[PDB]
Design a protein around this ligand. Sequence first.
Ligand SMILES: Nc1nc2c(ncn2[C@@H]2O[C@H](COP(=O)(O)OP(=O)(O)NP(=O)(O)O)[C@@H](O)[C@H]2O)c(=O)[nH]1
Ligand SMILES: [Mg+2]
Lengths: 16, 129, 1001, 208
Amino acid sequence: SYEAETVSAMALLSVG
Amino acid sequence: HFEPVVTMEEDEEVLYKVRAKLFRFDADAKEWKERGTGDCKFLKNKKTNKVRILMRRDKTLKICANHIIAPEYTLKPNVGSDRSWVYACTADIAEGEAEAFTFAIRFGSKENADKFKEEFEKAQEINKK
Amino acid sequence: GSMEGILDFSNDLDIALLDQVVSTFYQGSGVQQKQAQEILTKFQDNPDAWQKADQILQFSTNPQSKFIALSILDKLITRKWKLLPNDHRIGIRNFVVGMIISMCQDDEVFKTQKNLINKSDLTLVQILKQEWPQNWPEFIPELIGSSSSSVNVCENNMIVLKLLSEEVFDFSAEQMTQAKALHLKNSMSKEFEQIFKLCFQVLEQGSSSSLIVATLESLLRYLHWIPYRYIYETNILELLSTKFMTSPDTRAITLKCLTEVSNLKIPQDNDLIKRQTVLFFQNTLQQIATSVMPVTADLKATYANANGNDQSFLQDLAMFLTTYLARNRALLESDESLRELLLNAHQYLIQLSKIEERELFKTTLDYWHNLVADLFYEPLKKHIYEEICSQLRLVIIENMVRPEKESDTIQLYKSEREVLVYLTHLNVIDTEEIMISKLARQIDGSEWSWHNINTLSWAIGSISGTMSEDTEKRFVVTVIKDLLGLCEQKRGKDNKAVVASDIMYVVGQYPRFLKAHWNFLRTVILKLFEFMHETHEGVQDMACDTFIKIVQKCKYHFVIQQPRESEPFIQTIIRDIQKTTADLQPQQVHTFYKACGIIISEERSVAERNRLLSDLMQLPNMAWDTIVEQSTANPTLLLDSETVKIIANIIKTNVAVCTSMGADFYPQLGHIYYNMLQLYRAVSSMISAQVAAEGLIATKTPKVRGLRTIKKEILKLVETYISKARNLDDVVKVLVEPLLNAVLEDYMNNVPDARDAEVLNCMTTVVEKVGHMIPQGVILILQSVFECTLDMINKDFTEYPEHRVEFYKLLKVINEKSFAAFLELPPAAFKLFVDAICWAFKHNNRDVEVNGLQIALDLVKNIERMGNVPFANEFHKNYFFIFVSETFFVLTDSDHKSGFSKQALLLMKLISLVYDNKISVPLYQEAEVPQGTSNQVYLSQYLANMLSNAFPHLTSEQIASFLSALTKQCKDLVVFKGTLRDFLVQIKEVGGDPTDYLFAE
Amino acid sequence: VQFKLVLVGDGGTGKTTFVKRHLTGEFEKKYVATLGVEVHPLVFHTNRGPIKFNVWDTAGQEKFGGLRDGYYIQAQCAIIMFDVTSRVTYKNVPNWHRDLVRVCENIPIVLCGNKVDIKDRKVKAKSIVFHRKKNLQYYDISAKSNYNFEKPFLWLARKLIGDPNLEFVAMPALAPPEVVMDPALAAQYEHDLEVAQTTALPDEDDDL
Ligand SMILES: Nc1nc2c(ncn2[C@@H]2O[C@H](COP(=O)(O)OP(=O)(O)NP(=O)(O)O)[C@@H](O)[C@H]2O)c(=O)[nH]1
Ligand SMILES: [Mg+2]
């Protein structure tokens, strides 16, 4: 499977 | 109405703070000896506007340096290090009576060492007034 | 000064002067104290001071003075007792016994001089070890009789019996010969029936708690060795588990006794004993619940409050519960009337496991491991403990410690992980629910803290591999989602840093998920690359560590072309490496290149692997070509600290990639090899020139240290490759000769302070891997490093510590792989080789002593392998007895006890050579013994003479019996070692029994 | 308010080096065996006032043992030291404990495994269990890196004062006096400075 929303939210991880 | 249940640095300003290891030179043995590792702080007294070095050991927090940054002092390189300074101190009261020492202080980087020298000389100018 | 008068024995001892010296030492300070200390030490060590203990013990009014007098007597009794005239032996016994009696009869002295009475009791025990029972058969009967006439004497007798038991059963192994220990153990066993009667009578009837406590203290010692019948065929378990648990004065010692009872050797087929074992546990737990605290009590809080002896009690309760339950819980698991007891006991352990005390937690955690492993494997058991295990899941998750410098913490994490993995298998649904629930209370803020989100992340990461892949899938997604939203919702880089780190930690722990979700793995990596530009403290280190960690586990997914991608991802990493690493420190850049080397080595097509390798090394190879063009056109440039640092980081990058690629690194090594060794020589010249112009102090300067770093990293690079090379023909034909030409002369002809010990380490790897193929190369190594390194390290045991260690590692491997090189040594140099080995014996440094003893053993074997040829015959003639006497010296000098086992092995090999007639020539001179004398006879004669002169206080019979036993036992290492230990005991005293050496029969 | 602390253990385990570190801040690299005992006052500043330890640093080598257990009399606390790079020093821990508790029957005792800075550790954490049944506190320590170097005194202070919440605090830092260098001593000081400049600092590869 893919779980594309996990990926999306992962791509947006920010330290600030 | 319900009755409810029942350092001497406060008057100073921290101009500079850096982690460092302090050594004292034992002339009789001609070896350097560690005196402490911890934060070295330049503290400006709000009443007198005079700046001192204050350095405490990690964990035990015992004082390993406490003396005015006299304008007469001169920071000199040590033959074995590009990140340390050597200088004579005529009155340090870390252990009690104002004793004289030849100190060396080492830093994590040549960059921290050079900035220490920058701040050190700025502070000397403060104390000249 | 005046205090030194007590040291003048030609006069009478002034007791009041002694007491002033003693007071000044114990109560004084500074210079006075120090001076008195040295006087007291000189007084005590006077070999006639014992003659004045009689006076001190009668006429002094200072307890410290009498204590010192007893210490003096102790030295005499334990070392010279049997040398005394029999009158002094009787006299000393009499006034020790009498002094003990008189102190017990004076109730004031008995209560206020406990330390002095205890010392006197121990001194008495020393005499018993010498005199009892053979010359004092009435001691025990008279002790029992005298116990009835006074509570004080009875209590003190319990102390004497306690110390006697300790000296005979607990501390005899090191301090007595095997025969004497057995003699004393049999003697106590013979008369223990009487001893127990007195002990049990006191416990059953007495009311003095100080007497009860002392009796229980002695019982604790007895439980180490007595037969179980004394415990199970009497009423004593009832007394221990009821009466003595109610009073706090006796509760601590009684609990310790019951812990040892839980270790008695006991038959496991007797139903009545099983019921007794159940019963005393039932009694003990009942007393705890009614007299101490109920099972709901908050032991974490109690322990933290630290009132009275609560901490020691809770420690002892944990030891009791874990000890008993690890052995006997099956006794409680079938009978339904025992189920409440079983679970209450474990509920106490749950409560104990919440205490904030690292070492106590490890004790309970060891028990939990024992339990959950059994529930994992043992049919029909896990349902019993469902509620205990559910609570334990929460306990362990909430006290998870950091997994990845603190080695105490590393071990604890691994132990916690092991227990939690078992607990997850036992109920995977409950485990998941606890973790998701804990996560919710991080988001809702009710338990949010830096420590708490870290702890939970470590716990989640620790159970990887326990869930099904589909459950893991849903679980991972849930966690990552919740964690991402948690980071988004926090303010400031500090909070966002902590959470982003934990996110990457969890991800790195689930490679199975990553391997099956490429788009996810790709996004993970690209985020790490973004983080390699973040300057917040720690983000860059975290990004690099996570990167290489993921690569080690998922490398295959970087080297294949993935569906919907136009190239293996490793190519994409390489293309952008400069940007990706632009903001990283050198150390972190090297980690990145090392991670790339892991991936590249999974490419098994050689042409594609070498192309990836050359592409990966493009940046360092270009910087390298540049500097080789510059530093060659103007060797002065190398004095530029910035160029030196650039060079070192280039070499370090090659080391990093070589570390992960090993044999596959050869093409890159070939690109730089010849110019690298030329650089090695140029740097070597600059170091020498600087030492010449500035003196030895040059070696401390940053310039020279930077230059030597280049040399060390070059050596490390070659060592790293050669240690992993698979084509050894290329190593020998292409690498070795240029290497030796570059490093050996430079090492030999530098002053000692400029020699790099890394040269020795590099040579050790060369010899290890291809030594068998370069016999002339090995000879050249020895010629260039052996004598000049030996001269550095053979004046003391401390200077040049690294050269010392690497020196003997090199000799060891040369002796293993190219012994022929030592055969070529001229006789004077081979003698230095033998001296060097023995020099290694005498080191206390373990990293030298062990190799030295192994070199000696390997050397003897190498010589033996040669058969009956002149070199072997000359070796034995020249060096056999040197090795025997040097090995004996370190065995017996009490300063090399760490090497006993290997010293013994070497000595046994040497002795067995002679008694297997494996030495073909006589070991003696023509004149000093008749023709035909066997080497066996001469060896025994040589050894008798050696030991007679080295230990003149031994009798000829002692020496002869010791050597007869040692010789007989030279095929049996364990017994041989026992005989050596017996000898080490006997040389510490006068008058050892020579029949002791017949112990093995 | 002072407490006699006796420190025992095999020779070479780091007892004297540990105490020196606390006394002056220095790390002595040389092994000069203690002869008998050396007594040093050591004061810590806490939130309950200062606590003074009278540390009796005893000799671990048998030939230098001096009065041996005579040093233990009236001790109120103790540290037993071993070396995690030397198994034999841990094997001897029960012997030092035996001799100590025969004289000091109920005192707080810390067991310290020293030299954890050394990579090739020989006494593994999991092997260290002797403290459990004897109710000793245990710490991994390093006098060289200062790992946990304060914990033994902190724990003992809490036991001796009877306050589990006792903490070390920052001793007050008086104002330092003004400088007036003597023009006569100016030649002597530039001399001593030249020597100090040309004596290399030790351990130049340490992080500090
Ligand atoms: N690497 C390392 N060395 C240490 C450490 N502590 C002490 N040492 C070193 O170990 C050696 C012995 O030190 P020392 O304090 O004299 O041990 P001791 O227990 O007092 N010996 P004795 O009982 O004979 O007086 C010294 O060289 C010292 O520098 C440590 O924590 N780490
Ligand atoms: Mg010492």
